Amino acid sequence: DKAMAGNFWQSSHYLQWILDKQDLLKERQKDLKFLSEEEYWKLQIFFTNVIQALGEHLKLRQQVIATATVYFKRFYARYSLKSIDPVLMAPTCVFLASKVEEFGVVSNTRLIAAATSVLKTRFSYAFPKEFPYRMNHILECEFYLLELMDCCLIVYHPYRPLLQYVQDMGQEDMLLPLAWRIVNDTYRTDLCLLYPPFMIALACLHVACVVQQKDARQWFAELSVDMEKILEIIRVILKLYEQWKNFDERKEMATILSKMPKPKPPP
Amino acid sequence: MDYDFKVKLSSERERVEDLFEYEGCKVGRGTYGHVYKAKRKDGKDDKDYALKQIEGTGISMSACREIALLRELKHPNVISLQKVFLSHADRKVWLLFDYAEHDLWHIIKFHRASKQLPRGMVKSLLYQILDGIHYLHANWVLHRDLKPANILVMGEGPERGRVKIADMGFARLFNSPLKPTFWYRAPELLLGARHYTKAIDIWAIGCIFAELLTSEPIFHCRTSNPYHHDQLDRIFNVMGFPADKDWEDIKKMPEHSTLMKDFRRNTYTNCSLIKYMEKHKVKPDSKAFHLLQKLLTMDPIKRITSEQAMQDPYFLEDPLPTSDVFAGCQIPYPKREFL
Numbered sequence: 001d002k003a004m005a006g007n008f009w010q011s012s013h014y015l016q017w018i019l020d021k022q023d024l025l026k027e028r029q030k031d032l033k034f035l036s037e038e039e040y041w042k043l044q045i046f047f048t049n050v051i052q053a054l055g056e057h058l059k060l061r062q063q064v065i066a067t068a069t070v071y072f073k074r075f076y077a078r079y080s081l082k083s084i085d086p087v088l089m090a091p092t093c094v095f096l097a098s099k100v101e102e103f104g105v106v107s108n109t110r111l112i113a114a115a116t117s118v119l120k121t122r123f124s125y126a127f128p129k130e131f132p133y134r135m136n137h138i139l140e141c142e143f144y145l146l147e148l149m150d151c152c153l154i155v156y157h158p159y160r161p162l163l164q165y166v167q168d169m170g171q172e173d174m175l176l177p178l179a180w181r182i183v184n185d186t187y188r189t190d191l192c193l194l195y196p197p198f199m200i201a202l203a204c205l206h207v208a209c210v211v212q213q214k215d216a217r218q219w220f221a222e223l224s225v226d227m228e229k230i231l232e233i234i235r236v237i238l239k240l241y242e243q244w245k246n247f248d249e250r251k252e253m254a255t256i257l258s259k260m261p262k263p264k265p266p267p
Numbered sequence: 268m269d270y271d272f273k274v275k276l277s278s279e280r281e282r283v284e285d286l287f288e289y290e291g292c293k294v295g296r297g298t299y300g301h302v303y304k305a306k307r308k309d310g311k312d313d314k315d316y317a318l319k320q321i322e323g324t325g326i327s328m329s330a331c332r333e334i335a336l337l338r339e340l341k342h343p344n345v346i347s348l349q350k351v352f353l354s355h356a357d358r359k360v361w362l363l364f365d366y367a368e369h370d371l372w373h374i375i376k377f378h379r380a381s382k383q384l385p386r387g388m389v390k391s392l393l394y395q396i397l398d399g400i401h402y403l404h405a406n407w408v409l410h411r412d413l414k415p416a417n418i419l420v421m422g423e424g425p426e427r428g429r430v431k432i433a434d435m436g437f438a439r440l441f442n443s444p445l446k447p448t449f450w451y452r453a454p455e456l457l458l459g460a461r462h463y464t465k466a467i468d469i470w471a472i473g474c475i476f477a478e479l480l481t482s483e484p485i486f487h488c489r490t491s492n493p494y495h496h497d498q499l500d501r502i503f504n505v506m507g508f509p510a511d512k513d514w515e516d517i518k519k520m521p522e523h524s525t526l527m528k529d530f531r532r533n534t535y536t537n538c539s540l541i542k543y544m545e546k547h548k549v550k551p552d553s554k555a556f557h558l559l560q561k562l563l564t565m566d567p568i569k570r571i572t573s574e575q576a577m578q579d580p581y582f583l584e585d586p587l588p589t590s591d592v593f594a595g596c597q598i599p600y601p602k603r604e605f606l
């Protein structure tokens with residue numbers, strides 16, 4: 001779906017949802033009273049994986065899964081983990097993202113069965129009890145999500161520009177599968193909230209070139225781009241891979257989830 | 268859900284019934300949603316607004332896509348979303364726009380009932396419709412439901428006589444006309460075209476342009492099946508029956524064999540757009556006619572694009588298109604009645 005494809009520089013994504021890193025860290029301090037910085041990053045990684053598995057089970061294309069992931073990050077960029085249960089927010093984000101596309105529809109019963117099945121078969125290390133929410137909870141949460149996001153639903157991702165860049169290189173067979181997989185991995189970080197997607201694409205393609213010992217220095221030279229920003233993004237990617245190595249989500253996530261601040265009931 | 272979070276958002280939430288007076292001021296009653304003329308309650312606002320209450324409850328696929336695309340689209344000739352209200356209690360969605368007093372359905376009906384006053388009105392309308400559609404098309408957004416009722420025109424105010432394209436068909440399953448008036452439908456739709464295209468929008472603009480010149484729908488005519496016999500009969504009565512050379516890919520259309528069973532070339536041998544438009548006092552050697560013939564091309568791949576149409580020397584010929592289509596002249600058209 002190529003709707004608004006060349007409109008990024010006048011888009012709500014660009015004008016409202018590229019955030020300042022210090023504003024983002026300031027709002028995060030309220031949850032850092034409960035969780036360490038490392039634990040908060042481990043939580044955001046975990047929920048990126050939850051959303052990916054939900055989207056895979058429902059057979060959605062990667063762009064839709066990416067949009068749902070961006071909705072989730074946008075919500076928790078502004079609000080505490082205690083505001084709405086992230087177990088409820090994740091499938092709600094997938095549901096809303098699926099309705100922005102017109103090629104088929106996710107039914108109510110299929111969404112709920114997917115959340116129930118994915119959490120039990122793939123995330124039982126984190127969750128001891130079955131998915132407790134019914135469709136009325138998803139529908140209620142969707143209204144809050146749409147409101148917080150100021151109805152900003154069209155999201156731009158690095159896949160499209162990556163595709164153009166690898167075709168420009170004439171290196172689709174060699175570099176595309178690896179570069180694409182590194183784009184997926186960047187959703188385990190805050191990068192999509194801080195940088196335009198084309199810059200993330202270039203940084204992913206650079207890492208792919210280094211991994212595969214491919215000399216593309218001359219090609220990167222022919223681009224008109226701030227390379228300091230590209231290097232910043234590369235550094236976050238390399239950092240994610242070191243955190244990945246030191247993180248065992250299966251051993252740690254039940255403990256980290258228990259430390260999350262939890263939603264307060266009424267009096 | 269956290270209780271303090273919940274009551275804080277409830278306390279801060281803008282409700283449509285608090286901000287706008289609209290009860291009894293319904294002006295549209297379609298399937299997509301009811302439209303109301305609204306006035307601001309708070310700031311003593313002089314301006315009129317349009318409130319669309321979306322049909323059904325929750326956020327359907329069509330509601331989501333309409334909100335998603337309107338949130339991004341910004342052009343003078345495309346209707347401009349000001350605000351979305353989400354009413355939690357009844358699960359209704361309200362869309363706020365600036366109010367357009369007029370539209371081409373009512374403007375054309377007025378002329379038809381009376382019998383293009385300022386000499387550049389038809390031209391200026393056509394140019395602004397092409398400009399808005401071009402903006403949609405350049406962003407890979409199709410209208411998919413173009414007709415006179417969806418071409419609004421602003422009344423008295425800062426945007427006097429400006430066209431606003433509205434009621435885009437934002438949701439169509441698989442971009443398909445085959446999924447759940449035919450006067451503005453391109454012949455390829457009637458022969459079973461499986462997807463909406465830019466060309467389908469351009470045909471419809473052609474039909475509107477003919478209707479503005481004559482005051483009559485050019486393809487006026489009396490199931491889920493896309494094939495409509497009498498609508499195809501009306502197109503051939505006006506245009507003539509297409510030669511093999513005019514539309515080579517007609518053979519690829521799913522209903523081509525049905526067309527061949529039902530229709531003979533001989534039936535339309537003395538029919539043409541030249542002859543049709545001559546009967547309605549439009550000159551065949553006018554730049555207006557030559558542009559019209561480029562818009563109403565039977566083969567969609569031979570149909571002119573919106574950008575090419577905007578470049579036509581018709582728009583360089585006196586009178587030039589104006590930003591106010593009424594050209595500063597007094598608007599004689601009635602205001603809309605409340606329902």
Ligand SMILES: c1ccc(CCNc2ncnc3ccccc23)cc1
Pocket residue numbers: 294295302317346364365366367368370372373416417419433
């Ligand atoms: C027949 C033909 C057209 C209509 C238009 C109703 N629709 C509208 N009317 C006035 N302002 C609007 C502003 C934004 C969107 C729709 C509007 C109503 C009846």
